[PDB]
Amino acid sequence: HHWGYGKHNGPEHWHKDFPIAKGERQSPVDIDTHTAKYDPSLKPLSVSYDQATSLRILNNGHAFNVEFDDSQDKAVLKGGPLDGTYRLIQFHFHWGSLDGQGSEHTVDKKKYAAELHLVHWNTKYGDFGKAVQQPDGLAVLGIFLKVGSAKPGLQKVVDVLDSIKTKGKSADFTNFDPRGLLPESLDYWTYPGSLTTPPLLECVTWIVLKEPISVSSEQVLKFRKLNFNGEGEPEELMVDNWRPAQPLKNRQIKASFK
Ligand SMILES: CC1(C)O[C@H]2[C@@H]3OS(=O)(=O)O[C@@H]3CO[C@@]2(COS(N)(=O)=O)O1
Ligand SMILES: [Zn+2]
């Protein structure tokens, strides 16, 4: 029972066990749309998930992970500000107790109802564990969620949450296509940052899509029915598992669009 998102173990407490929490390149951050500068040196973003192989979904106590077989370059992210190939290992979300909060990154200080994170590791480092020890070890694709119409591509995810309500529970999740969670446009903002959960390693190149995807109230409400706790323990609804914006410090957020 280490860190968490509560009053006594949340984000403001993390620095104690993880000093880097107060580092020079921490995530998330607020994205100032007026200050972000168009970067013409950015290469076209390339998301290739046609051969993605989903395997299982797991409730890890602070979020749920949809894992993918990454033993091969089946689903990768390249281009944009990245050099090399980054392999998709899993995707997860961060959400709130209410629609007005839940996203980790913010846009002009605006918080979205949730935020999808598709985690990829630089194949040049061999495995995920070694990549996190490198400044350019990971590339995380962030996609904001706003409440409106339902997202067809997300329902299969929503429907299985009933089977992994508590910590430690997992369920088979093969044959799920992550392309169903992407918005139409790939316009994005990018900057060098870190993991948003301990160990908060500063090994991430963040790519945050400007266009949010719409999900229905019914869909988000199901996310809020998950538990932080393990089976048979007092219920602690899994909500507000997001780290607030951190100081930008010596960084510049670049935009892929003019
Ligand atoms: C599941 C979740 C949020 O936990 C985090 C842990 O960071 S870690 O690199 O030590 O390994 C775990 C898996 O990756 C993460 C990455 O989260 S994130 N929010 O930075 O994208 O995803
Ligand atoms: Zn995340």
PDB file of C-alpha atoms in Angstrom, residues 1 36 102 110 114 154 158 174 194:
ATOM      1  CA  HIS A   1       0.000   0.000   0.000  1.00  0.00           C
ATOM      2  CA  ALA A  36       2.493  26.653 -28.038  1.00  0.00           C
ATOM      3  CA  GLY A 102     -10.434  13.753 -14.814  1.00  0.00           C
ATOM      4  CA  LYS A 110      -9.592  23.449 -19.129  1.00  0.00           C
ATOM      5  CA  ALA A 114     -11.033  11.817 -18.973  1.00  0.00           C
ATOM      6  CA  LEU A 154     -14.937   2.047 -26.587  1.00  0.00           C
ATOM      7  CA  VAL A 158     -16.971  -0.549 -21.109  1.00  0.00           C
ATOM      8  CA  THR A 174      -8.178 -10.469 -27.349  1.00  0.00           C
ATOM      9  CA  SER A 194       7.487  12.065 -17.549  1.00  0.00           C
TER      10      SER A 194
END
